[PDB]
Each structure stands twice: as structure tokens, then as C-alpha cells.
From Swiss-Prot, chain A:
Top-level division of the source organism's lineage: Eukaryota
Family label: Belongs to the eukaryotic ribosomal protein eS19 family.
Name of this chain's protein: Small ribosomal subunit protein eS19
GO-annotated molecular function: RNA binding; structural constituent of ribosome
GO biological process, one term: ribosomal small subunit assembly
Subunit structure: Component of the small ribosomal subunit. Part of the small subunit (SSU) processome, composed of more than 70 proteins and the RNA chaperone small nucleolar RNA (snoRNA) U3. Interacts with RPS19BP1; the interaction is direct and mediates the integration of RPS19 in state post-A1. Interacts with RPS19BP1.
GO cellular component, one term: cytosolic small ribosomal subunit
Omega-N-methylarginine PTM positions: R64
PANTHER family registered for this protein in UniProt: 40S RIBOSOMAL PROTEIN S19
Positions of modified residues (N6-acetyllysine): K20, K108, K112
InterPro entries: Ribosomal_eS19, Ribosomal_eS19_CS, WH-like_DNA-bd_sf, WH_DNA-bd_sf
Curated annotation (Swiss-Prot), chain D:
Residues modified as Phosphothreonine: T1
Role summary: Component of the small ribosomal subunit. The ribosome is a large ribonucleoprotein complex responsible for the synthesis of proteins in the cell. Part of the small subunit (SSU) processome, first precursor of the small eukaryotic ribosomal subunit. During the assembly of the SSU processome in the nucleolus, many ribosome biogenesis factors, an RNA chaperone and ribosomal proteins associate with the nascent pre-rRNA and work in concert to generate RNA folding, modifications, rearrangements and cleavage as well as targeted degradation of pre-ribosomal RNA by the RNA exosome.
Primary localization class, coarse: cytoplasm
Stated family: Belongs to the universal ribosomal protein uS7 family.
Keywords associated with the record: Acetylation, Cytoplasm, Isopeptide bond, Nucleus, Phosphoprotein, Ribonucleoprotein, Ribosomal protein, Ubl conjugation
Record has Repressor as a keyword: no
Recorded name of the encoding gene: RPS5
Cross-link for Glycyl lysine isopeptide (Lys-Gly) (interchain with G-Cter in SUMO2), residue positions: K34
CDD domains: uS7_Eukaryote
GO terms, biological process: translation
Protein name: Small ribosomal subunit protein uS7
Stored InterPro entries: Ribosomal_uS7, Ribosomal_uS7_CS, Ribosomal_uS7_dom, Ribosomal_uS7_dom_sf, Ribosomal_uS7_euk/arc
Bilayer-crossing regions: none
UniProtKB/Swiss-Prot annotation, chain E:
Main location: cytoplasm
Ribosomal protein keyword on record: yes
Keywords: Acetylation, Cytoplasm, Endoplasmic reticulum, Nucleus, Phosphoprotein, Ribonucleoprotein, Ribosomal protein
GO cellular component: cytosolic ribosome; cytosolic small ribosomal subunit; nucleolus; rough endoplasmic reticulum; small-subunit processome; synapse
Protein's name according to its UniProt entry: Small ribosomal subunit protein eS28
Protein's gene: RPS28
From Swiss-Prot, chain G:
Family to which the UniProt record says this protein belongs: Belongs to the universal ribosomal protein uS13 family.
Entry-linked Gene3D superfamilies: 1.10.8.50, 30s ribosomal protein s13, domain 2
Lineage: Eukaryota, Metazoa, Chordata, Craniata, Vertebrata
Gene behind this protein: RPS18
Sites of the Glycyl lysine isopeptide (Lys-Gly) (interchain with G-Cter in SUMO2) crosslink: K86, K89, K101
InterPro entries listed in its UniProt record: Rbsml_uS13_C (IPR027437), Ribosomal_uS13 (IPR001892), Ribosomal_uS13-like_H2TH (IPR010979), Ribosomal_uS13_CS (IPR018269)
GO MF: rRNA binding; structural constituent of ribosome
Main location: cytoplasm
Protein name: Small ribosomal subunit protein uS13
Keyword Thylakoid on entry: no
Top-level taxon of the source organism: Eukaryota
RNA sequence: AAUUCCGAUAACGAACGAGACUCUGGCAUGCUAACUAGUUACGCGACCCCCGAGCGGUCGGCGUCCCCCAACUUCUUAGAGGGACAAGUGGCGUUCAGCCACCCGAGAUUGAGCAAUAACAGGUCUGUGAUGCCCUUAGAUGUCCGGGGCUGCACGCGCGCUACACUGACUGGCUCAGCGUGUGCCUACCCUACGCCGGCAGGCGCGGGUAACCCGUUGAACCCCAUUCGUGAUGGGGAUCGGGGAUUGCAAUUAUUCCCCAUGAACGAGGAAUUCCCAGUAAGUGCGGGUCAUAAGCUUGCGUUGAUUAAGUCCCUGCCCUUUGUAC
RNA sequence: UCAAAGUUUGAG
């Protein structure tokens, strides 16, 4: 039972938790202080967000490989209330997507592929697929 | 006419009202609780989450926008 | 010899290309089971054909589907079409034309859209208004 | 599931209409009643096509109203399901039967058409088409709910459920059922 | 006393602004009896109006 | 037919109502008792059928 | 839980204890949902608490972070008054202090009879927006 | 729908318009087709690591790594054909022209473009090395350089955006488009992947792209899914203004744009009045092109989500024909 | 099977 086979919401939850239990990701010093994009009015409520984003990042990489930072921004994109002028797309934070990718690099979940960007790595492919199995054996529901 | 001043508390007489009355409604939504009592809305929601973990009210549905609960499940 | 039938469904600009196959009944789309796809309020929609025919018919028929284009709701409505068309195609070509007709009847009496496409498509804007038929506000005085 | 379709949950069969007139323009079972109240469904082709559309989907579409909620059908489907879930808790019986009963006793039976009459506007009262009574009922009550649910801590769904219940019952408490009796009464006042 | 009345023949769309269909009706209780009256909304040959009054019967308007 | 069902008399002929309205020109022309006509038509003094 | 404060008086402003804490603080001039949330996250507070809980040591602890953001690693950027002309300081101002800083800037330019000053003085639109049509009071 | 037809007939036979036409949209497991499409299902030739299920085989999943001496054209692109004509059945109709319904299947009706005669003293002499007359013509009404101004604000109006929140807001997460456009230029420059630096605006390195080749499976928004908030001008709203920071530029002060913190106004759905619109339409929603060193609250296109209501009438507002009256 | 609806550069 691979990860595609699973309800991706409840996956990234266990992935992040997995990444928390391991306790060797590398969350930077800002974390608390930083917004997460020019979109956002605020920072995240979930204080351990980094664990969550890494997961989503790794779980994307399982799905579409070779995805650089630029790639990551466009994925982590959305609406930009410009107040009294109308709304637009805004690209997510470069650095948080760079740091996540460098943090998953240090774990050896990911590796920089030929033709640029990151692809998630075999030893990584293990882990995501492992926790997919976990979720599928949560219960018949 | 309309001005409403809601509670944000574990405030004795209400707390008795929840734990006595609330589990013998057929609709137990925080909206229904907030109207009955003068309880905030956030307060209500959490209270109804406490009662669920206690087991005194059934879960119907637990959706983004609206949570539905029920009477104990009598027999 | 293999019993392969590539068929497509359609809605707006979504091409769902189901692919019926001499298999053991999967029915999974892009690369994951029908139980997700994940607009999810529109799940029953893309179960309908399977519920209306029963697993008996799909049983020994594996269906891989690929979608692209359109929006979420369309895409569904395309695959919805696709597989139920594709099954009908499968039965025609390998099973028997009495069975095809039996099925086709049981799809139509529910809904004509499960096989026949909406020729409807987004109608072009003409200047002097924001859309097609609507015009911009006239001032007068 | 193959022989009989439910509505996700609810029973389609054993939903009895009473008024032999809404009968045929309430579409809750010919046999054809569906799983979901979504459906691409081009029932705006010809004049009466609309009537063979299922009443729940008709309601669903109506719900989806005012600026923001334009073409937000899921948004509104979710509502319809929750209202129904609330109805089954509160009232019991099929929420489809209750919805139907609203439609029956909620839209007017007579109405006042604006005829010219010289120049200063004085109407004459007329009957209403069965389809017109269902259209009204549908939108009246759907609007009723929505109008209630603005600045109050109450779910659309919940108010939608409460309206459908107090319309199904001759309550004089639904916005619709009250609105219905107004019309008729005016309608009488220039018959 | 409410009476149901089956619609036998749409006559023609009257009303000021084009609205109230002039409509010939059978009377359901006793089909022998038949009024003509004006109706709002889309009507068609064969369906049922609920008339509250049943002794009024319009003509030109 | 309402009346002939609720008659005392078996059969009964039912009477009529004889009225010689006079109209002034305006009043005719207004209530459409008489239109205007073309130069040809004006001359042709047959009643309408 | 917690049966105490409910209403709160800090830094000459009030605060609703009955409000949630991040969104309660913001009632002080010179702190917004950003800076509050930060100031609390440095303080290490169960920010799902209402402000009508929260021990008086904690509200002191917050205030100290709030007044002294740079000592508690609330960085450059998150500071309304950076490199402030009158002395080489970069910091956050709070309460009536803020308003006084503001008045000292509009004074400064009024004293310089600067174009901006003058348009403040005259009570106009200052950030060269058009005014034929708008801001009529 | 049509001065479109049937028919009557001091008219007969013609011409323009209308229609036909062109582009478009929707049908083609039929044809021609492809390494700048897909591949397509295979073969799985595999890799690949336990990648998973599983004691192990056999499956599930993609990433892809693939060429060509695999196999095609369902999806793709776009050619040439086809295809619907009110043709078929039943009504109604001088049993003509036609109209209604229904079968099969798009049901004559997808939507644009072009578009008569005769006008208007409509607009344009600031689009033109189209141009009459008139004016000026070196102390210029030619031209160029600097500077300002077209942005000025008791006020009145017109298109517009954003709102007034809970069907919502935020905060995370999941997840789907289509039309285009793009440097190496008519006078100086584009689109941008990837990797580092920065919270961010951006900065610095290397690459691809005159393009179905790279940007780019254009990983859009709304929508969906969990968050919190809780009817409080509240976390709705984001005007106003202070402080700093980025870029475009020869230069940005009268804030060029951009980011950050702080500030937090009116506004709780809007009088009388009136606009626009009937099907993938309105409305929502984003994304392209235009201008563009810098760049959209405008517009011109695109798709995505997707209704209520009509299928009618001349009440108003208008138009087209007939007869009539007219001191116009 | 009839409510109210007055006026219109001197500037060619």
C-alpha cells in the first residue's frame, strides 16, 4: 500500500509527527517570528508548522519529482488580498521552501536531482511509503 | 433591540445546566447551545467536545462548518 | 490476447480517458482509488455507475483512468462518463451485444450524461461588456 | 443500492405527497430520484423541463444565492445535507417528506397579478400555476432561512432545517408560510 | 370551500404585461362543470389549479 | 346552463333583451363601434358580416 | 477555567481579559496581531488562554518583552520605529509614547515647512493622491 | 427572424439588402498523421531500493532511464471528407407556405463577422509626408534643453474596485484550466527553470527558449478539507497616516511601483431613481493580451465554479408595416 | 366600457 493510495490530508499529519519523533530535521531560528509568505496576514497557528510543511514538501516530491524552490513557491501559492484593489496570486516564501528542502536534504529524505530541483530519495521513499502503510492500517474507515 | 453579552467561562450554574440539560436535546450543536445559554460559541463548541469525550452525547457529524450532536442514545 | 479498451469521457474541457482491461476490478483514477479523487461531495457521482451496475459487472474488468484539464467538478463528470462509457465499450467488443444493451439501458434510465457528452462549453465574451451576454453599465444623464 | 437508490442516507420511497397538483411538479419520486442533489442537468432548455428536475436539487440551486454564493453549489449542497441531518434528529421521519410537505403548504394558492386598470394601479386576483406554487415555495422558504441566518450564531443548515420544519408544519413562524398567508389574504382583498 | 380544477384548454395569454393565462378548466368533483379563469406562472393543458373561490370565472382583462 | 339546471320549469325558452342604443360619432369611434376607413372602403355601406 | 481577572489594565490602556490574549493585547497603541503574536510566542504562553486567566507575573513578563523587543530576539523588521532620526535607535513604541512620536514628526516637518508638513498642516491628502473627487469632509 | 415564403395581381422581368457566405462551437474507436503530441497499452528490457502488500512468488504505485531494428493513434495536433435537411412519424394548416409535437440523433435556433438605399452639417484638421483657406514664421505658434503643470480641491455628476462578514475570517492542508506571450528588434532590450543569499521586496550565480522543443504535467483562484474566532463596527473592512526597507530609472520630493511593522476611518445591504441580463448565460472566480524602464481599480481575450426566472405582451420605452387625420 | 401630461435659440 503506497502513499497515492491514502487520504493525503491525514497522511501529512502522521508524516510531520514522524518527522517530530525523529527529532533531527533542522527548524531554523526564525520560525516563530516569520510570516510564511506575502499572502498571509499572520504567521501559523500550529507552532510546529515546519514539521508539517516539510511533510507536504516531501509528500509532493514523492508525487512530482525534480521540484526546486521556485516550484515549491508556486505550489505553496494562493490569494493576495490587496485590500481595496482586487486580489491576485502571490508566490509563497522562497526561503522557507529552500530551508525545508535543505532540511530534508540533511535527513536524506531528498536529494538534488540531475536537471535541477529536488527529487525525494530512496531512503526517503521508504519512509513516506512506510507511514502510508501505517495510515491504511489505522482502521477500516 | 439586539445586543448580546456572552460568557467565556466554567461558571457553576451554567456548568450544571450543560451537564444536566444539554444531553436531552435532539439537536446539540454549539449554535443551539449558544442560543439556549448565553454561552459564547467557542465556549459552547469546546463544552460539547468535553461532553463527547465523557460520552454523554453522540456524534452525528463533524464538518468544517458545522458539528452536530445528539442525546445519549437511550433504550 | 488482451482485452484492452481505451475510452474517454468529457465535460467542458476535461478529458477523462478511462482504460478498461482484462483484470480483477480496481477502478482507480490518475493513480488512486475512487473513494478519494477528493471534491468528495461529488464522490457518489463517480461511484454512481458502479452502484447502478454493481460490482458484478466491473468484477473482472480493471479500469485505470487519466484526467487532465477542466476543473475539479468537470473532471469528475468526465471520469463519471468515461468509465461507464468504457465498460459499455468493453462489453460490446468482448462480451456480447445483449449485455451491452442491458447495461446501457440501466445507465440511461438513471442519467443520459453518463454516456452522452454535454456539448455545452464556455461561451465567448464580446467587447462592451464583461462577459458574453452582459453589457457594461449605461450612464445616460 | 442497485435496486433502490437512497439519497446518501434517506428513504426515497414512502414519501407521500398529498395535494394532487403539486403532484407531478414535485419531483421526489417518479421512480427517478437520485443520489446527489448536484447534477450538470440542463433543465433550462425548454419551458417545463425544470419540473422534471428533482426538488432537492431545485432547492439546492436556490440556496446558492446572493453575490458571494453564486455558483457555489457544493457549498450549498453541504448545507442541504446538514439541514436534512438536523431534520432527522429533530423531527424524525424522512427529511425529504418534510421538505416536500413544506413545498406543499408554503407557496401560495392564489395571487394578485398587476393589471393596469386605467392608470392608478389596482389589481385583480388570480389562481397560480402548480409550478409557480413550487417555485415560490422553494425560493420563499430558502430565502426565509437565509434571511434569518445573517447576523446570528446559527448555521445556514440549521435555520434551513428549522424553516423546512416550520413550513412543513403550518406554523405561522416560517418566513415563507407567513409570507404565503399574506399573499393569499391580499389576494382575497382584491378578488 | 376549496375545489380542485383540472385544466382542459389553455386559451391564450392575457394579462397587461403578458402574464395571466386565460385557461379553461374541468372541475374534478364533477367534470361536467367548467369555468374559464386567469392563472399566473407557466400552465399547461392538463394539470390542476387549486381555486379558493369557485364561482367567479373571469373573461377579458 | 347553471340556470337551466336550477329551473323550476321543465325546459323553458329563456327570454331576450332588446336594446336600440344610439351612439354619437365620438362615442362610436371610441368604444370601437365603428373604425376609420380608407378612401375606397369608406364608400362601401354594407354592414359587417 | 480560571476565575480571576476579566478586564485588565496595562500600559495606561485597558485590555479585555474576556478577549483572547493575542487579540486582546492589540488594544494597545503600537501592537498589532503580528507583533502581539510574536511577543507572546517569545514569552512562551498557552496563547489559547483568555487574558482573564494568565498570572500577573505573566502579564508583566509579556509587557517586558513588548517594551524591550530586541532583548528577547524580536528582530529588526518587527518594530514600528526603526532608526528614528532623533537618535540612532531602532525599537517599538507603545501607547501614548507612539502618539507623541507621531506628533514630533509632523511637528518636525511643520517646523521645516516641508511640503508634506504643509499638507498635514493644511489638513489635506499628503501622499499625493488626487483630491478633486475624494476625501470630502 | 426576415419585403422570408405561399398566393392574389396593370403589371412583367430584374437589382441591393435578408438569407446563402466566412470564422467559430459541439459529433465522429472512420481516413490521412507524428522524437517540437501522446507515447499507448504492451514488452516491463529495465533501474531502483524494500518502493510497498506479502514468509516468498505474484500484484499496486509512480518516478522515471529508454532508444529504435516495439505497437499503435483512444486522449494530441490539424488536414481532407463526412454529418441535419425541419429528412422521418403523428397532429394543425386552402391539407400550399409553414407551425406544433415526438423518434433517431446536435432538432430548422452555438455564437460572432460581413452587412442596403438616403441621410447626420455626429466625431475626427491632436493618426497620417490626406488636405483648402486663414494664422504664425527667428524677440517663433518651428525646434530643443531645464523647471513646473495636466495629479492642484468649499463642491456636483459618470464608469469602476473594495466592503459591510459566520454561506464568513483567518491558519494550515488537499487539488483541477484555458486563451495567449516571450530576447538576440525600427534603436536596446524579453520570457524565465535550477542553485545559493535575504523574513520579504528582492540579490547573486550558472542553464533552456525566436519556441507543441525552455518557461511549462503553465501544479490559478474560488471551490474542497481540517483551524480558530463567535454576532461584538468583532480577528468583518482596510481607507487615513508614521517609521524603515527593496527594485525601475538620468532623475520618484506632490508619497513610480514593491515589502515590513505600526495606524485602524466610513460602512451593519443603501431614499427618490435607475443599469445589465434568459444557458455553460448572470454572477462569482482567477489567469492571459493591450499600454508597459517602471505598471491596472481600465479594457480586450481566456477558461474555472455555476443559478433563479421566461419562453410571453405591448402596460411603459421604443421600433416595422397598413389605413386615417394634419394649419407640421 | 375614457385619472394627470404645460412649454420649447434672438443667436442664421
Amino acid at each position: 500500500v503506497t502513499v497515492k493510495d491514502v487520504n493525503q490530508q491525514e497522511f501529512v499529519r502522521a508524516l510531520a509527527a514522524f518527522l517530530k519523533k525523529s527529532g533531527k530535521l533542522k527548524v531554523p531560528e526564525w520560525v516563530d517570528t516569520v510570516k510564511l509568505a506575502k499572502h498571509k496576514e499572520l504567521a501559523p497557528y500550529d507552532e510546529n508548522w515546519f514539521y508539517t510543511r516539510a511533510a507536504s514538501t516531501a509528500r509532493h516530491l514523492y508525487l512530482r519529482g525534480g521540484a526546486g524552490v521556485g516550484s515549491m513557491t508556486k505550489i505553496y501559492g494562493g490569494r493576495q488580498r490587496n485590500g481595496v484593489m482586487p486580489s491576485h496570486f502571490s508566490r509563497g516564501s522562497k526561503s522557507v521552501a529552500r530551508r525545508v528542502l535543505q532540511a530534508l536534504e540533511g535527513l536524506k529524505m531528498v536529494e538534488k536531482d540531475q536537471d535541477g530541483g529536488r527529487k525525494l530519495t530512496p531512503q526517503g521513499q521508504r519512509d513516506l511509503d512506510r507511514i502510508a502503510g501505517q495510515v491504511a492500517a489505522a482502521k477500516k474507515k | 433591540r439586539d445586543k448580546l453579552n456572552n460568557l467565556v467561562l466554567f461558571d457553576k450554574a451554567t456548568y450544571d445546566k450543560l451537564c444536566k440539560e444539554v444531553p436531552n436535546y435532539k439537536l446539540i450543536t454549539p449554535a443551539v447551545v449558544s442560543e439556549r445559554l448565553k454561552i459564547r460559541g467557542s465556549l459552547a463548541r469546546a463544552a460539547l467536545q468535553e461532553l463527547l469525550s465523557k460520552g454523554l452525547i453522540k456524534l452525528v457529524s463533524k464538518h468544517r462548518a458545522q458539528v452536530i450532536y445528539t442525546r445519549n442514545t437511550k433504550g | 490476447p488482451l482485452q484492452s479498451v481505451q475510452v474517454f469521457g468529457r465535460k467542458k474541457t476535461a478529458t477523462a480517458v478511462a482504460h478498461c482491461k482484462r483484470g480483477n476490478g480496481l477502478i482507480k483514477v490518475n493513480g488512486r482509488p475512487l473513494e478519494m479523487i477528493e471534491p468528495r461531495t461529488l464522490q457518489y457521482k463517480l461511484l454512481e455507475p458502479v452502484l447502478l451496475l454493481g460490482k458484478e459487472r466491473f468484477a473482472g474488468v480493471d479500469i485505470r483512468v487519466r484526467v487532465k484539464g477542466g476543473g475539479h467538478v468537470a473532471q469528475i463528470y468526465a471520469i463519471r462518463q468515461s468509465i461507464s462509457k468504457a465498460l459499455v465499450a468493453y462489453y460490446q467488443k468482448y462480451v456480447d451485444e445483449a449485455s451491452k444493451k442491458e447495461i446501457k439501458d440501466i445507465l440511461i434510465q438513471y442519467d443520459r450524461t453518463l454516456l452522452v457528452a454535454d456539448p455545452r462549453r464556455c461561451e465567448s465574451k464580446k467587447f462592451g461588456g464583461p462577459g458574453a451576454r452582459a453589457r457594461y453599465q449605461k450612464s445616460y444623464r | 443500492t442497485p435496486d433502490i437508490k437512497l439519497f446518501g442516507k434517506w428513504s426515497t420511497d414512502d414519501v407521500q405527497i398529498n395535494d394532487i397538483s403539486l403532484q407531478d411538479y414535485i419531483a421526489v419520486k417518479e421512480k427517478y430520484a437520485k443520489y446527489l442533489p448536484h447534477s450538470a442537468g440542463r433543465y433550462a432548455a425548454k419551458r417545463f423541463r425544470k419540473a422534471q428536475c428533482p426538488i432537492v436539487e431545485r432547492l439546492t440551486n436556490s440556496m446558492m444565492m446572493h453575490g458571494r454564493n453564486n455558483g457555489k453549489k457544493l457549498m450549498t449542497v453541504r448545507i442541504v445535507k446538514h439541514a436534512f441531518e438536523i431534520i432527522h434528529l429533530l423531527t424524525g421521519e424522512n427529511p425529504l417528506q418534510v421538505l416536500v410537505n413544506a413545498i406543499i403548504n408554503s407557496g401560495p394558492r392564489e395571487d394578485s397579478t398587476r393589471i393596469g386598470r386605467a392608470g392608478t394601479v389596482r389589481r385583480q386576483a388570480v389562481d397560480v400555476s402548480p409550478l409557480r406554487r413550487v417555485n415560490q415555495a422553494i425560493w420563499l422558504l430558502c430565502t426565509g432561512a437565509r434571511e434569518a441566518a445573517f447576523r446570528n450564531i446559527k448555521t445556514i443548515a440549521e435555520c434551513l432545517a428549522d424553516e423546512l420544519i416550520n413550513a412543513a408544519k403550518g406554523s405561522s413562524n416560517s418566513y415563507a408560510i407567513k409570507k404565503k398567508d399574506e399573499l393569499e389574504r391580499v389576494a382575497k382583498s382584491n378578488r | 370551500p376549496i375545489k380542485l380544477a383540472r385544466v382542459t384548454k389553455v386559451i391564450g395569454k392575457t394579462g397587461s404585461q403578458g402574464q395571466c393565462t386565460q385557461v379553461r378548466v374541468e372541475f374534478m368533483d364533477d367534470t361536467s362543470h367548467s369555468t374559464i379563469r386567469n392563472v399566473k406562472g407557466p400552465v399547461r393543458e392538463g394539470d390542476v389549479l387549486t381555486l379558493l373561490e369557485s364561482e367567479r370565472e373571469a373573461r377579458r382583462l | 346552463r347553471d340556470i337551466s339546471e336550477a329551473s323550476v320549469f321543465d325546459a323553458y325558452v329563456l327570454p331576450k333583451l332588446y336594446v336600440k342604443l344610439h351612439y354619437c360619432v365620438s362615442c362610436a369611434i371610441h368604444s370601437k363601434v365603428v373604425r376609420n376607413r380608407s378612401r375606397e372602403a369608406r364608400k362601401d355601406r354594407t354592414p359587417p358580416p | 477555567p480560571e476565575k480571576f481577572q476579566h478586564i485588565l489594565r496595562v500600559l495606561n490602556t485597558n485590555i479585555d481579559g474576556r478577549r483572547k490574549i493575542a487579540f486582546a493585547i492589540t488594544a494597545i497603541k503600537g501592537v498589532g496581531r503580528r507583533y502581539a503574536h510574536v511577543v507572546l510566542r517569545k514569552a512562551d504562553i498557552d496563547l489559547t488562554k483568555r487574558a482573564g486567566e494568565l498570572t500577573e507575573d505573566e502579564v508583566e513578563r509579556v509587557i517586558t518583552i513588548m517594551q524591550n523587543p530586541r532583548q528577547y530576539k524580536i528582530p529588526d523588521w518587527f518594530l514600528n520605529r526603526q532608526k528614528d532620526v532623533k537618535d540612532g535607535k531602532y525599537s517599538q513604541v507603545l501607547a501614548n509614547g507612539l502618539d507623541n512620536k507621531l506628533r514630533e514628526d509632523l511637528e518636525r516637518l511643520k517646523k521645516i515647512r516641508a511640503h508634506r508638513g504643509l499638507r498635514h498642516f493644511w489638513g489635506l491628502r499628503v501622499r499625493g493622491q488626487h483630491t478633486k473627487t475624494t476625501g470630502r469632509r
